[PDB]
RNA sequence: AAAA
């Protein structure tokens, strides 16, 4: 044979070239995979173990049930798998401290298995495969690309065995060890390896990140992915209102394993990615109110997507907060209530107001009686709505208003009981109160002022919609002018 | 009514 011929000078360089192009006849098979049971005595034998398995998984004509038996000695239930599970190859960088340009960031693959661990590097310890089988409670198949002394690979293969999806892996390395119950050890040249990761594009996660297997598997399986989006005002507010989100998020139990720093690295975003900072607004520029509305769908659309990594759009879970009203209304209006989003008011700190993860049209949901909000009406066409739920009161102005529009009907919406310091909590049932006094009570024209927290107008923006015929006024300070945006517009069409 |  071809290959029995470069076997027999020790050409396994010329055999890895070999396999690495597509072009292997059957009959090359038996010998190919006598190879992977030689010992790693050097880096080439090892190199072409890897090229070999990479090929009869990706290119499973090669992929043989009576070669894996009679040559690998495994099992059927093992050759199976073997041959059904999908692999995962993940990314670790190792430094030789003895030589320096030995180091490498290294690959591992893996494939999961149901009751044998093994590999088929002669140099891995079998005891740290063990390890990483009783901390994550799978069985494994494990081969590396190189070979390496030390066990800082083990958060490595860790990561591939817990991962759901390829994606995640992609673009991220590890490196660390792993106790028996699943808790991170760390290990040494933490600054020579990130360099080597960086190097290849990538990002290393260092047990400086991870701390145990249940906060890695809260990033490569998760259940509800949070993210953030923040409004505000001012730039020098930008990064510490960042961390305050991560505050108020961490205090949720689903989220206690939430780290700011792991979101960007995990799925490659930056802090701007995560706010939108409008200093001053001109809200009778209609251009430069759609630069801003644009801007905020590009960053939600990113943020709801990420880079294709998240599959299932149910498990991002978006953290949301605004700071002006007039603004937010608009946002909620594109932003829907098909979304799993939980609304944060800020006060001192980020507070959750409004959580649509149970329910995401709770604050849309009609009530008989109005237990949150008194309601003043005079329904005629045009109607005037007057929302009052702050400490400033726009009923003197938004009437002033009615009568220079010429509209014959109002509708004043006001807090029932205390007024401009609503109890912190559940904001919903106040939402789904003035969304009930709006929809019942709508004209063929209408107008709207509002004097309300701006995560108030946020979550009624998404109840709402851009079905309504409202047109929207901002106070600039002192009087009330005309937002060059109906609130129907087709520009306003949610597209989550 | 510009994180009320």
């Keep these: 044979g071809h290959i029995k011929q470069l076997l027999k000078?020790?050409?396994?360089?010329?055999?890895?070239?070999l396999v690495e192009s597509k072009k292997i006849k059957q009959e090359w098979l038996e010998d190919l995979y006598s190879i992977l049971l030689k010992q790693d005595t050097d880096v080439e034998i090892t190199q072409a173990k890897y090229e070999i398995i990479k090929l009869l998984l990706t290119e499973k004509k090669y992929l043989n049930f009576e070669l894996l038996t009679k040559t690998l000695n495994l099992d059927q239930q093992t050759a199976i798998e073997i041959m059904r599970n999908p692999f995962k190859e993940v990314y670790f960088p190792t430094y030789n401290i003895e030589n320096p340009e030995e180091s490498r960031l290294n690959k591992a693959l893996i494939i999961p298995l149901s009751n044998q661990t093994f590999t088929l590097n002669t140099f891995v310890n079998?005891?740290?495969?063990?390890?990483?089988?009783?901390?994550?409670?799978?069985?494994?198949?494990?081969?590396?690309?190189?070979?390496?002394?030390?066990?800082?690979?083990?958060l490595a293969v860790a990561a591939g065995l817990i991962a759901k999806e390829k994606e995640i892996l992609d673009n991220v390395a590890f490196?660390?060890?792993?106790?028996?119950?699943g808790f991170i050890i760390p290990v040494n040249h933490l600054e020579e390896k990130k360099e080597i990761t960086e190097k290849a594009k990538?990002?290393?996660?260092?047990?400086?990140?991870?701390?145990?297997?249940?906060?890695?598997?809260?990033?490569?399986?998760?259940?509800?992915?949070?993210?953030?989006?923040?409004?505000?005002?001012?730039?020098?507010?930008?990064?510490?209102?960042?961390?305050?989100?991560?505050?108020?998020?961490?205090?949720?139990?689903?989220?206690?394993?939430?780290?700011?720093?792991?979101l960007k690295k995990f799925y490659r975003l930056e802090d701007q990615d995560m706010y939108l900072i409008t200093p001053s607004v001109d809200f009778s520029n209609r251009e430069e109110l759609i630069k801003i509305l644009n801007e905020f769908r590009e960053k939600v659309s990113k943020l709801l997507t990420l880079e294709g990594v998240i599959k299932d759009h149910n498990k991002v879970v978006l953290?949301?907060?605004?700071?002006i009203s007039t603004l937010?209304?608009?946002?909620?209006?594109?932003?829907?209530?098909?979304?799993?989003?939980?609304?944060?008011?800020?006060?001192?700190?980020?507070?959750?107001?409004?959580?649509?993860?149970?329910?995401?049209?709770?604050?849309?949901?009609?009530?008989?009686?109005?237990?949150?909000?008194?309601?003043?009406?005079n329904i005629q066409d045009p109607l005037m709505?007057?929302?009052?739920?702050?400490?400033?009161?726009?009923?003197?102005?938004?009437?002033?208003?009615?009568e220079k529009l010429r509209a014959?009907?109002?509708?004043?919406?006001?807090?029932?009981?205390?007024?401009?310091?609503?109890?912190?909590?559940?904001?919903?049932?106040?939402?789904?109160?003035?969304?009930?006094?709006?929809?019942?009570?709508?004209?063929?024209?209408?107008?709207?002022?509002?004097?309300?927290?701006?995560?108030?107008?946020?979550?009624?923006?998404?109840?709402?919609?851009?079905?309504?015929?409202?047109?929207?006024?901002?106070?600039?300070?002192?009087?009330?002018?005309?937002?060059?945006?109906?609130?129907?517009?087709?520009?306003?069409?949610?597209?989550?």
């Design 9 to 17: 000078n020790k050409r396994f360089e010329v055999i890895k070239a």
């Design 126 to 154: 079998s005891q740290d495969l063990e390890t990483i089988k009783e901390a994550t409670n799978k069985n494994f198949f494990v081969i590396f690309d190189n070979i390496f002394s030390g066990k800082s690979y083990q």
């Design 175 to 181: 490196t660390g060890e792993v106790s028996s119950n």
């Design 202 to 262: 990538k990002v290393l996660i260092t047990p400086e990140d991870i701390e145990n297997l249940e906060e890695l598997s809260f990033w490569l399986n998760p259940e509800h992915l949070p993210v953030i989006f923040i409004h505000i005002n001012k730039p020098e507010l930008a990064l510490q209102s960042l961390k305050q989100m991560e505050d108020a998020i961490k205090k949720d139990e689903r989220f206690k394993y939430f780290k700011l720093e792991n």
């Design 319 to 323: 953290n949301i907060s605004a700071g």
């Design 328 to 377: 937010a209304l608009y946002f909620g209006v594109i932003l829907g209530n098909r979304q799993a989003s939980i609304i944060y008011h800020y006060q001192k700190e980020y507070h959750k107001v409004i959580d649509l993860t149970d329910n995401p049209r709770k604050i849309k949901e009609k009530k008989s009686e109005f237990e949150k909000i008194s309601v003043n009406k």
């Design 385 to 402: 709505i007057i929302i009052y739920l702050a400490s400033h009161n726009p009923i003197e102005k938004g009437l002033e208003l009615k």
């Design 408 to 496: 014959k009907g109002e509708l004043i919406i006001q807090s029932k009981e205390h007024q401009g310091n609503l109890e912190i909590g559940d904001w919903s049932d106040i939402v789904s109160e003035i969304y009930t006094a709006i929809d019942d009570n709508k004209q063929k024209e209408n107008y709207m002022v509002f004097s309300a927290p701006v995560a108030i107008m946020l979550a009624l923006g998404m109840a709402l919609g851009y079905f309504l015929p409202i047109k929207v006024f901002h106070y600039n300070r002192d009087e009330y002018i005309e937002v060059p945006i109906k609130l129907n517009e087709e520009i306003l069409r949610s597209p989550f």
